[PDB]
A paper describes a structure:
An asymmetric homodimer class was identified, resulting in a reconstruction of the previously uncharacterized BlaR1(WT) transmembrane and zinc metalloprotease region to 3.8 Å with a local resolution extending to about 3.3 Å. Dimerization defines a central cavity, which in the native membrane is presumably filled with lipids. The loop connecting helices α8 and swapped α9, housing the scissile bond between residues Ser283 and Phe284 (residues 271 to 289; here termed the autocleavage loop), enters the zinc metalloprotease active site of its own chain, directly demonstrating that autocleavage occurs in cis. In the WT structure, one chain shows clear separation of Ser283(P1) and Phe284(P1′) supporting a post-autocleavage state. The autocleavage loop is in the approximate position for cleavage, with the P1 Ser283 carbonyl orientated favourably towards the catalytic zinc, which canonically acts to polarize the scissile bond, promoting its electrophilicity and subsequent nucleophilic attack by an activated water to promote cleavage.
BlaR1 and MecR1 are membrane proteins with an N-terminal zinc metalloprotease domain and a C-terminal extracellular β-lactam-binding sensor domain. β-Lactam binding to the extracellular BlaR1 sensor domain regulates BlaI cleavage by the zinc metalloprotease domain in the cytoplasm. BlaR1 forms a domain-swapped dimer, with the zinc metalloprotease active site accessible from the cytoplasm. BlaR1 undergoes spontaneous autocleavage in cis between Ser283 and Phe284 and we describe the catalytic mechanism and specificity underlying the self and BlaI cleavage.
Residue numbers in the entry:
A (entry chain C): 284 to 337
B (entry chain B): 1 to 55, 98 to 337
C (entry chain A): 1 to 55, 98 to 283
Write the structure that this text describes.
Amino acid sequence: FNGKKSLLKRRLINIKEANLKKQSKLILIFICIFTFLLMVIQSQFLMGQSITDY
Amino acid sequence: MAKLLIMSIVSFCFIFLLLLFFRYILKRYFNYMLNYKVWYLTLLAGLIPFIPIKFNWDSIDNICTVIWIVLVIILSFKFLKALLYLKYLKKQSLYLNENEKNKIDTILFNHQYKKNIVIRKAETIQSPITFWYGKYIILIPSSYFKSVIDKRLKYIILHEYAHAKNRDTLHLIIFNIFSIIMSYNPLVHIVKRKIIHDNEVEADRFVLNNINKNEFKTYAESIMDSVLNVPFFNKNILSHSFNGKKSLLKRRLINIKEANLKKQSKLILIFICIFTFLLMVIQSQFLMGQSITDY
Amino acid sequence: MAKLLIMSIVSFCFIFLLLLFFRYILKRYFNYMLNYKVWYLTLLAGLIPFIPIKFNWDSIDNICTVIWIVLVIILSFKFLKALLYLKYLKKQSLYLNENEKNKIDTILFNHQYKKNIVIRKAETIQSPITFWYGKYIILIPSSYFKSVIDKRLKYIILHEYAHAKNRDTLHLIIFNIFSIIMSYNPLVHIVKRKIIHDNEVEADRFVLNNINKNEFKTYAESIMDSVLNVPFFNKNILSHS
Ligand SMILES: CCCCCCCCC/C=C\CCCCC(=O)O[C@@H](COC(=O)CCCCCC/C=C/CCCCCCCCC)COP(=O)(O)OC[C@H](O)CO
Ligand SMILES: CCCCCCCCC/C=C\CCCCCCC(=O)OC[C@@H](COP(=O)(O)OC[C@H](O)CO)OC(=O)CCCC/C=C\CCCCCCCCC
Ligand SMILES: [Zn+2]
Ligand SMILES: [Zn+2]
C-alpha cells in the first residue's frame, strides 16, 4: 500500500527470508580477477596525454 | 585538451556498467551479497587515462578549465560544512554509569568484541547516530537508559555496532573526498548513494543472526516504531543516521502530523497560470520555426 | 531538422524551471498548495515554436529521425500490456451484499456523496486498488468485510473516495499518452512522479479533515500496518495502489 518501492520496504522484504547462506569469496574472487584483467585490456587499448606536446 | 576528460568519462562508465551487470544475477538467483569494497576499483580504473603513459572549437576547453575548479570549491564547502558539525557534535558527549554499562555488556559480551571503538551518551539529538574520526563513535541519548525498561536497547545498540564492524564510517569519508576532486562525472554520485543501501542491508542480517525467530518478528515491529517518532535528518553526509532517509513515506507522515487546513485566495492560481501563459507568448513572439518553411 | 528538436526541448525547459520555483517557494514560506492541473501547460508551451508558423549535419539529422520512431513504439508496447492487465481485473470483480452495503451506507451516511462512481469487491488481490475506464472503480479485497472489528473500512473508504472525486486517474491516462509521443525530452517523463507524489498527499488532507482529532493517531497507525504486513505490486503503473 506504500506509494512505491523504497528502502524501508526493501529492508522489510529481506527480513522475511533468513539469509542462511555461506556467501563464499570463491565467487567474488572469480569476478574480481576477471574484472581486473579487463582493465588491463582497457589500458593497452587506450591511453593518451598532453605530455606529447613538444 | 579536455578530450582527456571525455576519455575519462568513457572509462569510468565501462567498469561501472560491468559491476552493475553482475549484481542482478548474484542476488536474483543466488542471494549473495556483493562485497561492496570492490567499488573502489571503479575509481581507479576510471582515472587510468590521466597517466601520461606515453606508451576555435577548443575555446570550450578554455571554459571547461574552470568549471572543474569551481565545482571543487563548492564541494569543498559542502564537505566542510558537515565536517565542522562533526567537530561540534563530538565535543558535547559524556561517558556512562556502571549500571548501564553492566546492561550493555550483558547484551554484547557474547561477541566479546574488539573494544577499540567507543560507547558514549548524549543529552542532545533524539536518535542515536555514528561517525568515525579515528575512534568509531557510538552516541546515544540519556533518555534511552533512564528508560532502563525501554527494552529496545537490545536491538538499537547492536545495530550501531554492526556499522562499526565493517568500518562503514571510515570508507565513507575517504570516498567522498576523493570523489570531490574527480567532480566531473555524475555517475560517481550514483555510486555515492548506492553503496549505502548495501551497508544497511548487511546490518540487518547482522542483527537477525543474533536473535530468535520469535524475536525476529518483534524486532521488525520495533523498527517501525523507531521510524515513527521523529522527523528525519541529513545533517552529516559524513555519517550514518538511524531514521532511514529522505523519502515519500516519511514526508507524508510528517505532513499528516502537522495541521493542514487552509485555502489560498484564488488569485494565486488565476494569475500563476496567466503569468505562465503570457510569458510563453512572449517567448514565441521572437521564437518560432520548422524546416517545412524552407523553400 | 535538428533545429526543431532543439527548439522543442528548450521551450519546454524554460517554463519548467519557472514553475518549479513557484511551487517551492509558495509552499516553503506561506504553507500553500498549488493545483497540479497547471502542469498541462508545459506540454503546450513546448509545442508552440514547433508548429510551422512564423508568427556533418546530414548525419545528425538522419539518425535523430530514427530514434524518435523507435522510442514511441516501445513505450506504447509497455503501456498496452498494462492496459489489458486492467481489463483482467474488471472481469473478475463482483458486487457486495446488503449488509456490506449497509456498512458503506453508514460510513458515508452523512457524506451523501455522489454515487456515479462504483464500489465492488474481489478475492484476487490482498490490498485495494483503483482505476478509471470511464466509471471510477474502487476495488477492495473480498476478505475484508467479514471482519466485524477491522476498523479499517472507515479509513479505506474515505481514502479512496477522495481519490475518485478528483478524477485523478483520468488525468494520468491522458497525461501518459502525451509523453508516449513526445518521448525524448526527459523532463516530460519526469513530471509524472511529481504528479503522483502530490496526488496522494492531497488525498490525505481530505481525509483528516473528516475525522476526530483523538483518532488522528489511529489513522496513522493503520497506514503503517497497511505496508508493514504486505508484499508489493505495481502491475498497473498507470494506476494508484
Ligand atoms: C545522472 C543522473 C543524476 C540523477 C541522480 C539523482 C537521484 C539519486 C538516485 C539514487 C538512488 C537510487 C535509487 C534507485 C532507483 C533505480 O531505479 O536505480 C536502480 C538502478 O537501475 C538501473 O539500472 C538504472 C539506473 C540509471 C538511471 C538511468 C536509467 C537508464 C538506464 C539505462 C542505462 C543502461 C545503458 C548502458 C550504457 C551507459 C553508457 C552511457 C538502483 O540499483 P539497485 O537498487 O542496485 O537495483 C538492482 C537491479 O535489480 C539490477 O537490475
Ligand atoms: C541531460 C540534459 C539535461 C538538461 C538539464 C540540466 C540539468 C543537468 C544536471 C543534472 C543533475 C541535477 C540533479 C537535480 C535534479 C533536479 C530535480 C529537483 O530539483 O528536484 C529535487 C528533488 C526533491 O523535490 P523537492 O525540491 O522536495 O520538491 C517537491 C515538490 O513538493 C513538488 O515539485 O527531487 C527528487 O529528488 C525526486 C526525484 C524523483 C524522480 C525520479 C527519479 C529520477 C531522479 C530525478 C532526476 C532526473 C534526471 C535528470 C534528467 C534531466
Ligand atoms: Zn544503519
Ligand atoms: Zn491513495
